[PDB]
């Protein structure tokens, strides 16, 4: 039976109280700015000496001061409205602090481009500078800029080309998404099932492998039709890339992309190398699939099918069960995450009437961290606590041990603490259990994510890679090259276990723009980091569990792989990456003589 925000019991929500006792007061903290002509005057250009240690130190000083007022009161009123998405003052509220931090992006606009244009000779003055200590790497990282920044004109240009650019991914999308007709799936009894991309994952795990075959056929048929089309926009996206790379003085798109996060092109470049030296891996684990579901043979649309076949969970049950399962993460975080969940108010707990769907963890420098759940009771949520408690853990920890400008970690690094927990979970539950068919969902369901976040990203990797390469050196990527290149690396990868379908080679075709500049790397080395920091954590490698610790401490006080390296892993060489290995290797294993 569902219910309005305001007959749900307060024990089941969260308590933003410690942010703003009620509206009023947060309503009165916003006035505090007096909306206006400038808001803050204090942040004009004018009134700051940028040669000056003393002055850029005020300017950091004062801006951080603001940013975190405006965050506190955007988290405030953001979590306000999830609760009911509907409601008007939540919905008005949110809109004024939006308001204002768009206010104070414009205002503070100028700062970014007058320290990148400082002299070399300033530059390394302040960072020298005592008084600034505290804030050298945020300089840092905006100091870092400068060589590959041109005179403010020629910049002022390539700031105004992003808007003709957006031409790609939106004719993509419209594509995509919405003009190009979608076709029918089949299943065995010959009932047709139309298709959705929604339905299409939904059919990838079907039980009736002929749904799945005509599904992914669909599928393809679909995207093969226009393949000169998607092959003409994705060329232009990739030209967009080498554009803007070669003009801000970058030997690649990737370095340009690289950059910001400081890794070198060998990690992306090894991680690639590396990965499909693996590549038996994936034919160790389909194998088993195709041998468990008498299959002559091992198509795409295998891979996901699942090998076996429910229970219910209350609120305090999950919770009980994260409690024992992360048992290895230490008295201390099992705790801290317990009282969160339970007395100290992190959690709004269930479904009510327009409350914001799904999942996700929240909060700011000076609140605990916020969870909205969507709590339903199967294992897929209390997995969804595990991953949530992983991200609200790791929020917790940074902004307890760093101050306000360094404690958020980068997107680099966020899903590290969210993924090793839900693989402890998995972990520990098959430890624990007795029933072999729950063993093998269990194993399943957790060599699928592997599988699919950490082989198919680095697939993905490569193909972005080469593409790239190729426009470098002029090749334009025609729907013959583009679906070559997908075909070969289709080849490196799973060669040796899949049967390809004749339109296999199209894939490349159903990726969105937006997984293009480089960024779907970072979902394999997050796994990667998370399995290895997990894999010494089950095998009590020296101190590997305070190293954990560490890094969930670190916030984002320095460069990714820095920060890493702090901590034991060093993805600058091939430790790492072989911990990974040896996690997915034991359960292969495990599974293989299940059966
Ligand atoms: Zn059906
Ligand atoms: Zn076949
Ligand atoms: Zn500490
Ligand atoms: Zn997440
Ligand atoms: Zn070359
Ligand atoms: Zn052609």
Not at 26 to 45: E, H, M, V
Not at 127 to 144: D, H, N, Q, T
Not at 296 to 305: E, I, L, N
């Amino acid at each position: 039976q569902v219910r309005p925000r305001s007959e749900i019991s307060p024990q089941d929500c969260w308590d933003i109280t410690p942010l703003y006792l009620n509206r009023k007061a947060w309503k009165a903290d916003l006035d505090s700015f007096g909306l206006k002509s400038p808001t803050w005057p204090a942040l004009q250009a004018t009134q700051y000496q940028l040669d000056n240690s003393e002055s850029l130190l005020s300017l950091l000083t004062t801006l951080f001061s603001i940013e975190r007022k405006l965050n506190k009161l955007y988290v405030y009123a953001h979590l306000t409205h999830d609760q009911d998405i509907t409601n008007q003052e939540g919905i008005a509220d949110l809109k004024s602090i939006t308001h204002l931090h768009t206010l104070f992006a414009e205002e503070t606009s100028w700062v970014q481009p007058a320290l990148t244009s400082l002299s070399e000779s300033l530059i390394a003055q302040h960072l020298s500078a005592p008084c600034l200590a505290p804030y050298r790497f945020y300089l840092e990282k905006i100091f870092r800029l400068s060589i590959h920044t041109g005179t403010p004109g020629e910049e002022k240009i390539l700031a105004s080309a992003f808007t003709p650019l957006e031409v790609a991914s939106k004719a993509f999308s419209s594509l995509s998404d919405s003009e190009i007709p979608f076709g029918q799936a089949t299943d065995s009894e010959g009932n047709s099932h139309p298709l959705s991309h929604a339905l299409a994952s939904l059919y990838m795990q079907s039980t009736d492998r002929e749904l799945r075959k005509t599904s992914y056929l669909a599928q393809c048929e679909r995207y093969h039709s226009y393949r000169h089309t998607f092959a003409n926009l994705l060329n232009g996206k990739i030209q967009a890339h080498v554009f803007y790379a070669k003009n801000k003085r970058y030997n690649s798109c990737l370095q340009a992309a690289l950059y910001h996060n400081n890794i070198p092109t060998t990690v992306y470049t090894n991680l690639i190398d590396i990965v499909k030296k693996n590549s038996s891996l994936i034919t160790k684990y389909f194998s088993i699939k195709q041998r468990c579901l008498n299959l002559k043979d091992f198509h795409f649309y295998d891979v996901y099918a699942p090998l076996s076949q429910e229970k219910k969970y209350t609120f305090q049950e999950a919770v009980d069960l994260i409690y024992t399962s992360l048992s290895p993460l230490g008295t201390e975080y099992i705790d801290t995450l317990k009282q969160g969940l339970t007395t100290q108010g992190w959690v709004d707990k269930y479904e009510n009437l327009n409350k914001r769907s799904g999942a996700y963890s929240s909060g700011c420098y000076d609140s605990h961290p916020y969870v909205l759940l969507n709590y339903t009771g199967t294992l897929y949520d209390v997995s969804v606590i595990a991953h949530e408690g992983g991200h609200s853990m790791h929020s917790y920890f940074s902004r307890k041990h760093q101050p306000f400008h360094d404690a958020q970690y980068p997107i680099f690094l966020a899903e590290i603490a969210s993924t090793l927990n839900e693989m402890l979970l998995m972990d520990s539950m098959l430890k624990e259990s007795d029933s072999k068919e729950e063993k093998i969902t269990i194993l399943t369901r957790c060599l699928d994510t592997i599988f699919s976040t950490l082989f198919r990203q680095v697939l993905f990797a490569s193909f972005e890679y080469d593409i790239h390469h190729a426009a470098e050196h002029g090749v334009p990527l025609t729907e013959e090259y583009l679906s070559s290149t997908y075909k070969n690396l289709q080849n490196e990868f799973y060669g040796e276990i899949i049967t390809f379908d004749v339109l296999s080679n199209i894939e490349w075709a159903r990726i969105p723009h937006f997984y293009y500049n480089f960024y779907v790397y970072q979902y394999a080395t997050g796994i990667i980091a998370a399995l290895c920091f997990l894999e010494k954590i089950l095998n009590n490698e020296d101190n590997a569990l305070n190293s954990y610790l560490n890094f969930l401490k670190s916030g984002g006080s320095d460069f990714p792989l820095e920060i890493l390296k702090k901590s034991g892993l060093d993805m600058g060489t091939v430790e790492p990456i072989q911990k990974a290995f040896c996690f997915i290797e034991k359960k292969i294993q495990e599974l293989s003589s299940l059966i």
